[PDB]
RNA sequence: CUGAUAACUUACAGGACGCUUUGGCUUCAUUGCUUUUCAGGUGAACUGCCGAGUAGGUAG
């Protein structure tokens, strides 16, 4: 038994990634005063490109979901007609169960990232033997990927502009209650807990 | 004038700039890149070329050869403007020697101008060029940010007397020749961006590559690294920056062309006055504002020559 | 004269000059070219000049700043290559004695007598030494000799009973005629062209192999296809071991070892032996039929030229120089029938 | 005489010559040709001379410089090939003993009796030798034999019981009849061309295989097509393994092995055994009916030639040299009915 | 006699020949011909002989040597073929019993009596064997059997309970009549021509295929189309799998198996059974109406032959030889109207 | 009798027999012929005989050998084809009861009464059996059945509630009349024709399809045009798929199924049912008015034939045989005017 | 507002029989396609930790 309060980015000229980034940034900023790992992310009309002009917030107990939209961020946005919000509607049991997992192995393929991986492998060569020759590696020739459709998150403790990127896999229409994470999530290392779209 | 079949042949003949990675054990492997295409769930290929981890330095090897193919045109059609052009070049040869163009061509070889962007955020880079015909030792230019900046920094004792001359003989002596084999060592930082030449693809970022030791390597063009050592033209109405020696002194990154056919300082109005320019070189002395600065451009455009038909 | 059906068969049959790349392992691969597209700038004369004024404002500073792209075939020496090996074969036969078709046995008998008189009076030594100074100095490479360190020519004649004939670095050593006229290499292979021109059923086949030392990644210039009218600068190519490779032509390298004609009114530089002494660079032609030193103006005076070869001595200003040219045109051509 | 319906059927039935490039790997490939475009000079006599003086200035010194482009077919040996292999079959039959149609059964007797009297008196040795010498000396290659190192000919006769009769390198070895007429080879296969012509329902089928060693990517010269009336020099071709390959004629390799006629007014060269004795090179035909030595001037006095082949002996000047020409035109025969 | 409406229907109905090229893969593709233009020389008797002198000097030694083009269809075995497969079907019927039209019940019962009396007295063995000897010796191939290594014939009759009848190489094995009498083949295929001629509504449908082993790319000779009036040899063709193929006639293959007529004044060779015994080679027709041994002068004595076929014993030279001709003429019969 | 105007319509309506060549893939193309020119000998009796002596001195031994050309249409099965399918439709109707035009209501009532008495007294079995026996044994192909391995005839009758009527290999199996009377469908298609003759406005359509196994590229014989006044032997053709095809005629394959008449004075062979019994093999017509057995010597006696058909009993040799022949002529006939 | 005002052409059909177009053939000499060329990532998707790990995970 789940509920959702949708937010629609209204004014018809908006880099939806830049909006969805800060919306998930304040969901990440949410649940740090209270260690609660309950709520999903639910991108409803995720297209081939340009993530859709609204976002649903399918949730757990619903004492959290309403509380999630009482953060004085969405309030301070609301005085200008930017967002339009719904009244916590029941999920119908006839719905698609898509998993919105942040892959994070996309940035194991960038040379800046592969430099990190080799440098790690070189530091933990203290598992003794022959200290491996760092000339025995090749960025393949055609490292081909789909689809990953990235956002624009930034770190808060440090001034590092990290970027998390979400995929759209679908299976097994019921799993756990919930387990999730700080960044909403459908990924957290144990459960592939899908989202009712 | 412009007699319907007039063609000169280039004197500066550059090659491809083959990139190489030197490891700390003194063994040189060709620099290899990777090409990612995005297969959006139901073509657009982007290439990435960074310096691999634990690399000592980067070698950039190419060969430029100065020849004497500016004395006589390749096709003339009419032997009336022929002797005019042969007289014009040998008058320029005698009156105001080949020192200026030679030095200007040899500065942007011996300072790494042909690397274009790979010198940016680099600690130090050293250029060694082997000339021919030569009799002794390799001419080496050490760290070219601190030591060599201006002309006078290049005009030191044991290097510059004997390699600017041998370009002057290679332009004057009919069936004359000079072959410089240039080799630059970039000391780029840990996993820096290398910017090679990008191929056309009529409509993003797929490079020009050749196969060295069975595997592909980015190449930095042939007509790009020739258009780099001929970024010489700065005798255009006033002066801001050295341009590529075209006919209409065309700028690339900004999409305008200085030396318009309207301003009367482009290679077609300056050419057709040649018979006048033979006059002012006959007796002393040439005013070095409209004469020397135009004869420099005229000769600099003859070295890029072919074709001036109709 | 010119009896409506006179033809001659050519007396020098060259071949295509196959390029090979030899590596420091003493192994050979075919030299392979690629077709690349490049971005030129609008530097054509008639893109900002009508005839020969200034245009409407369609040649504005925006219009002449757009790069016009060409697609050309780029062939260069691969990195780590030792040197380039160019190989062809030439055949000297005696198919200038008797015309292929004659039609009338009064001009035929004239021309067989004229060849026999030229042979016996002023022999084939001049034309032989001239035709062999183009095979042995690498004129058939055309452009690849400009900006080359050293090129050595090794040629294998037939019939022969000994070693190979090899001319080493040909920029310093073999410059003049006397430099070629040395010990083991000229008295014996100028003879066997003279015995292959003077004798019936005469033959001399040379297999020529030139080694080019070009600089690092140096540009190699083969011949081009005609393409009777984007892709300009398309190379003539043939298949070696499955791989396509550029070829430098068969007819181009026949017009390399037949650029001996410096007997045209005054003198500048040797032309290719044509009827109307056509120069390709200067697009005018020396020996225009007005001057009366083209082929047909000299041929029709054959019965005159026989009477000058009656007794001593042949004048070396306007008879030897003209009969050289006449015989040089009988060696090449066919047909001159009208 | 010549009774309005009189045709003969030919005795010698040759075929196409398939060219096969053979490599050092002991594999064979069909020799392929390519349509190559090229740039010749303005070298035609009619361009710069009208009739028979000088052209008015539309044909200036610059108009004779622009090279006219031709499109020809180029066929050469590929680089790294061992030799060229030329295969054809020839079949000698007994189709000269009786005319195909006769119309009058009094002139059938004359021509039948004439062939019987020629057989019994002056036998088939001369014609059979002159036919087979052309088969075994490589006349049927025409021009590929010239500018070649060495060429071997191996032919398998039928019916036969022994080794294939190998004629090795034919330049130094076999030049004259006595070099051909030696021990192991020749006397056994000149009979079976006699016993083909002499006996009723007689037949001999030779399959001739020649190997040409030409120089490095030398030019192969096959037969060209007519095209009844740009592209000059179109090669006649057949398809081997769905790949087009040049052919060197069928009626061209019959014209080759029947170049016998040196029994004509003077005597210079073997002509192709025709009626009016057409020499293709020197266009004027020997055995013109004004001479009275052509086929119809010889046949219409056959009743004279039946008198001479009884009494001992016959003169080898104006009897045997005419009877040879007679049988040479009955072997090619068809049709001479007026 | 000859009652103004007398016609017979034919008894032997052959079909068109189909040439297939069998490859070493044992796959069969149809034989295809091409049309090639070729250069002959002026060989016609009426180009240098009016009647019977030498003509106006437009046909001199110059104009008699100008080569004239013809155009011909060339059909040959392709290079790398195993053998040619020639397939057709022949049908023996009993339509020689009653006339198709008779008009009068006086000649009808006469002719029906004459067939029954011939059938009874001297049976079909002679004719049946003669018709079957040149279905099985490949006479129907006409010209291709000459200049061929060996040809095998396999035929499948109907009705039949057994294995296909096979005559292997018909050059050495099968020459004479007796040689066709092998123990296990011949005696039971003569029968089903004797009991398909004799019995009412009788039948025999032979399907015959011959394999031809020819030399290297040798010419195959099919049948040529008439063209009532430059083009000699326009071959008769049909479409197999969308490809045109040369056919060798429908009536020609019937005029080959019916060459059995050697019962004429003397006897040289078998003629095609006609009313006036026409020989197409020697254009004079033997068995002329003047002799009184033609069909129309033998038929009109029919009432004579019915008397002779009722008493002992029929003289095997005048009566039997004429009864053979009568019945062999009724077998292809049609039509004796006047 | 013969009242100057008296016409009957047709009761058997056949069609054109469309030839189709069918391949091993079971795709059917139309059959195609070609006009090929050929060279024949001088075989005519006219060219070497006056009457009945010897020719002028222009028919000499050389003049009797210069072969003369003709131009003949040639149709054959193409190479590699499986077999030939021949398709047409017969339509039996009840247009033999009353004359189409009659002019005088005295002979009309006579002929209607005569048909009714022949219907009730004698069966339609005899005529219908003789009619059906040569729609189902391939008489309608004439000469294509001769020199052919086997032919199979499948017919789709109408009106019909069931399957298709099939006749397999017709050379051994279906030879005699009893072989047709065998098991299943025969007893219902000799019926429904008698319904098509007995019932007023009765109708029976039979669509026939024959398969022919001819030898390899065998000769096919269609019907030829007339050409009244050069191409001798021009084939009758029609358009299928926009290409021409040989046809075998409408009236030829009506003259095949209507070969009943073997009651003519004695008997040798069944003829075409004409008035004067015209034979084509021999060009003398049997059953002509000097015998008094033609259609006009039998019809004028029609009234007499009624007086025998009422009482017992008709002798099956003269009276019944002529009543069969009358009705065989009534089915085909039109028009018995004069004039 | 028509050379106006009205108008049933019907019935029946067997083109068939026979055929040899063929003989001979030389397309071939000559050939230079050439000259000059910038495709363009402002900085920008980072640093760990677990893994024996060019396997895969994950925080910020």
mmCIF file of C-alpha atoms in Angstrom, chain C residues 156-306:
data_model
loop_
_atom_site.group_PDB
_atom_site.id
_atom_site.type_symbol
_atom_site.label_atom_id
_atom_site.label_comp_id
_atom_site.label_asym_id
_atom_site.label_seq_id
_atom_site.Cartn_x
_atom_site.Cartn_y
_atom_site.Cartn_z
ATOM 1 C CA UNK C 156 69.098 -7.005 -64.822
ATOM 2 C CA UNK C 157 69.527 -7.216 -68.652
ATOM 3 C CA UNK C 158 68.767 -10.189 -71.014
ATOM 4 C CA UNK C 159 70.494 -11.743 -72.871
ATOM 5 C CA UNK C 160 73.361 -11.566 -70.259
ATOM 6 C CA UNK C 161 76.052 -13.993 -68.867
ATOM 7 C CA UNK C 162 77.499 -12.393 -65.666
ATOM 8 C CA UNK C 163 76.521 -10.190 -62.640
ATOM 9 C CA UNK C 164 73.872 -7.371 -62.305
ATOM 10 C CA UNK C 165 74.427 -3.722 -63.486
ATOM 11 C CA UNK C 166 74.014 -1.340 -60.475
ATOM 12 C CA UNK C 167 74.250 2.511 -60.400
ATOM 13 C CA UNK C 168 74.707 3.659 -56.725
ATOM 14 C CA UNK C 169 73.543 7.061 -55.219
ATOM 15 C CA UNK C 170 72.468 9.090 -58.363
ATOM 16 C CA UNK C 171 72.752 12.737 -57.161
ATOM 17 C CA UNK C 172 76.584 13.018 -56.541
ATOM 18 C CA UNK C 173 78.138 10.309 -58.834
ATOM 19 C CA UNK C 174 75.986 10.121 -62.056
ATOM 20 C CA UNK C 175 75.196 13.824 -62.876
ATOM 21 C CA UNK C 176 76.666 14.251 -66.446
ATOM 22 C CA UNK C 177 77.054 11.917 -69.520
ATOM 23 C CA UNK C 178 80.806 11.141 -68.873
ATOM 24 C CA UNK C 179 79.838 10.008 -65.283
ATOM 25 C CA UNK C 180 77.701 7.221 -66.971
ATOM 26 C CA UNK C 181 80.452 6.510 -69.628
ATOM 27 C CA UNK C 182 82.762 4.653 -67.104
ATOM 28 C CA UNK C 183 84.151 1.089 -66.990
ATOM 29 C CA UNK C 184 81.902 -2.049 -66.753
ATOM 30 C CA UNK C 185 78.463 -0.429 -67.205
ATOM 31 C CA UNK C 186 78.195 1.514 -70.576
ATOM 32 C CA UNK C 187 80.390 -0.064 -73.378
ATOM 33 C CA UNK C 188 78.456 -3.408 -72.952
ATOM 34 C CA UNK C 189 74.730 -2.320 -72.432
ATOM 35 C CA UNK C 190 74.693 0.551 -75.055
ATOM 36 C CA UNK C 191 75.788 -2.313 -77.353
ATOM 37 C CA UNK C 192 72.840 -4.863 -77.212
ATOM 38 C CA UNK C 193 70.463 -1.864 -77.823
ATOM 39 C CA UNK C 194 72.460 -1.128 -81.069
ATOM 40 C CA UNK C 195 72.351 -4.926 -81.913
ATOM 41 C CA UNK C 196 68.597 -4.925 -80.897
ATOM 42 C CA UNK C 197 67.891 -1.935 -83.290
ATOM 43 C CA UNK C 198 70.261 -2.878 -86.237
ATOM 44 C CA UNK C 199 69.567 -6.696 -86.420
ATOM 45 C CA UNK C 200 66.258 -8.337 -87.542
ATOM 46 C CA UNK C 201 64.451 -10.361 -84.750
ATOM 47 C CA UNK C 202 66.611 -8.217 -82.350
ATOM 48 C CA UNK C 203 65.633 -8.065 -78.623
ATOM 49 C CA UNK C 204 67.004 -6.632 -75.308
ATOM 50 C CA UNK C 205 64.880 -6.900 -72.071
ATOM 51 C CA UNK C 206 65.946 -4.947 -68.893
ATOM 52 C CA UNK C 207 64.311 -5.574 -65.443
ATOM 53 C CA UNK C 208 64.992 -2.277 -63.517
ATOM 54 C CA UNK C 209 64.763 -2.001 -59.655
ATOM 55 C CA UNK C 210 65.139 1.455 -57.938
ATOM 56 C CA UNK C 211 65.537 1.903 -54.100
ATOM 57 C CA UNK C 212 64.173 5.317 -52.805
ATOM 58 C CA UNK C 213 65.323 6.582 -49.329
ATOM 59 C CA UNK C 214 62.537 9.140 -48.495
ATOM 60 C CA UNK C 215 62.317 10.966 -45.100
ATOM 61 C CA UNK C 216 59.897 10.101 -42.179
ATOM 62 C CA UNK C 217 56.197 9.783 -43.347
ATOM 63 C CA UNK C 218 57.220 11.340 -46.756
ATOM 64 C CA UNK C 219 54.442 11.797 -49.413
ATOM 65 C CA UNK C 220 54.724 9.382 -52.447
ATOM 66 C CA UNK C 221 53.284 10.706 -55.797
ATOM 67 C CA UNK C 222 51.978 8.006 -58.209
ATOM 68 C CA UNK C 223 49.999 8.636 -61.483
ATOM 69 C CA UNK C 224 46.222 9.500 -61.548
ATOM 70 C CA UNK C 225 43.160 8.144 -63.499
ATOM 71 C CA UNK C 226 41.598 10.523 -66.121
ATOM 72 C CA UNK C 227 37.876 10.378 -64.977
ATOM 73 C CA UNK C 228 36.242 12.014 -68.093
ATOM 74 C CA UNK C 229 33.676 14.530 -66.637
ATOM 75 C CA UNK C 230 33.143 14.689 -55.149
ATOM 76 C CA UNK C 231 36.585 13.013 -55.772
ATOM 77 C CA UNK C 232 39.423 14.774 -57.700
ATOM 78 C CA UNK C 233 43.044 13.402 -57.437
ATOM 79 C CA UNK C 234 42.037 9.664 -57.771
ATOM 80 C CA UNK C 235 45.118 7.337 -58.156
ATOM 81 C CA UNK C 236 45.691 4.681 -60.879
ATOM 82 C CA UNK C 237 45.963 1.414 -58.823
ATOM 83 C CA UNK C 238 46.380 -2.392 -59.324
ATOM 84 C CA UNK C 239 46.016 -5.387 -56.906
ATOM 85 C CA UNK C 240 49.177 -7.041 -55.393
ATOM 86 C CA UNK C 241 48.573 -10.053 -53.020
ATOM 87 C CA UNK C 242 44.861 -8.994 -52.663
ATOM 88 C CA UNK C 243 45.789 -5.402 -51.526
ATOM 89 C CA UNK C 244 45.185 -2.421 -53.921
ATOM 90 C CA UNK C 245 48.359 -0.292 -54.559
ATOM 91 C CA UNK C 246 49.312 2.703 -56.788
ATOM 92 C CA UNK C 247 51.133 1.946 -60.054
ATOM 93 C CA UNK C 248 52.741 5.124 -61.707
ATOM 94 C CA UNK C 249 51.308 3.976 -65.125
ATOM 95 C CA UNK C 250 52.720 2.119 -68.196
ATOM 96 C CA UNK C 251 52.255 4.961 -70.796
ATOM 97 C CA UNK C 252 53.572 7.613 -68.286
ATOM 98 C CA UNK C 253 56.898 5.641 -67.885
ATOM 99 C CA UNK C 254 57.150 5.263 -71.717
ATOM 100 C CA UNK C 255 56.977 9.117 -71.907
ATOM 101 C CA UNK C 256 59.740 9.230 -69.183
ATOM 102 C CA UNK C 257 62.364 7.122 -71.119
ATOM 103 C CA UNK C 258 61.457 9.053 -74.355
ATOM 104 C CA UNK C 259 62.122 12.698 -73.163
ATOM 105 C CA UNK C 260 65.306 13.040 -75.345
ATOM 106 C CA UNK C 261 64.108 15.750 -77.847
ATOM 107 C CA UNK C 262 66.427 18.824 -77.434
ATOM 108 C CA UNK C 263 66.917 19.122 -81.284
ATOM 109 C CA UNK C 264 64.008 21.694 -81.542
ATOM 110 C CA UNK C 265 64.796 25.037 -83.192
ATOM 111 C CA UNK C 266 66.940 26.794 -80.452
ATOM 112 C CA UNK C 267 66.889 24.682 -77.171
ATOM 113 C CA UNK C 268 65.473 24.994 -73.589
ATOM 114 C CA UNK C 269 65.010 21.454 -72.055
ATOM 115 C CA UNK C 270 64.308 17.962 -73.571
ATOM 116 C CA UNK C 271 60.644 17.398 -74.719
ATOM 117 C CA UNK C 272 58.796 14.044 -75.057
ATOM 118 C CA UNK C 273 59.342 12.933 -78.732
ATOM 119 C CA UNK C 274 56.038 14.106 -80.365
ATOM 120 C CA UNK C 275 55.147 15.016 -84.012
ATOM 121 C CA UNK C 276 54.301 18.706 -83.199
ATOM 122 C CA UNK C 277 57.045 18.993 -80.456
ATOM 123 C CA UNK C 278 54.353 19.677 -77.765
ATOM 124 C CA UNK C 279 55.546 20.929 -74.307
ATOM 125 C CA UNK C 280 53.074 20.223 -71.409
ATOM 126 C CA UNK C 281 54.263 22.890 -68.845
ATOM 127 C CA UNK C 282 54.453 25.734 -71.443
ATOM 128 C CA UNK C 283 51.071 24.814 -73.104
ATOM 129 C CA UNK C 284 52.410 26.249 -76.437
ATOM 130 C CA UNK C 285 54.082 23.697 -78.822
ATOM 131 C CA UNK C 286 57.581 24.066 -80.411
ATOM 132 C CA UNK C 287 57.821 22.532 -83.965
ATOM 133 C CA UNK C 288 54.418 24.052 -85.000
ATOM 134 C CA UNK C 289 53.928 23.038 -88.705
ATOM 135 C CA UNK C 290 54.460 26.761 -89.724
ATOM 136 C CA UNK C 291 58.191 26.493 -88.648
ATOM 137 C CA UNK C 292 58.631 23.408 -90.951
ATOM 138 C CA UNK C 293 60.385 21.177 -88.312
ATOM 139 C CA UNK C 294 57.369 18.985 -87.297
ATOM 140 C CA UNK C 295 57.402 15.253 -88.319
ATOM 141 C CA UNK C 296 55.481 15.411 -91.685
ATOM 142 C CA UNK C 297 57.458 18.476 -93.013
ATOM 143 C CA UNK C 298 60.697 16.400 -92.379
ATOM 144 C CA UNK C 299 59.281 12.957 -93.550
ATOM 145 C CA UNK C 300 58.171 14.264 -97.040
ATOM 146 C CA UNK C 301 61.863 15.345 -97.673
ATOM 147 C CA UNK C 302 63.014 11.643 -97.264
ATOM 148 C CA UNK C 303 64.206 11.440 -100.953
ATOM 149 C CA UNK C 304 66.230 14.670 -100.194
ATOM 150 C CA UNK C 305 67.682 13.194 -96.908
ATOM 151 C CA UNK C 306 68.865 10.021 -98.838
#
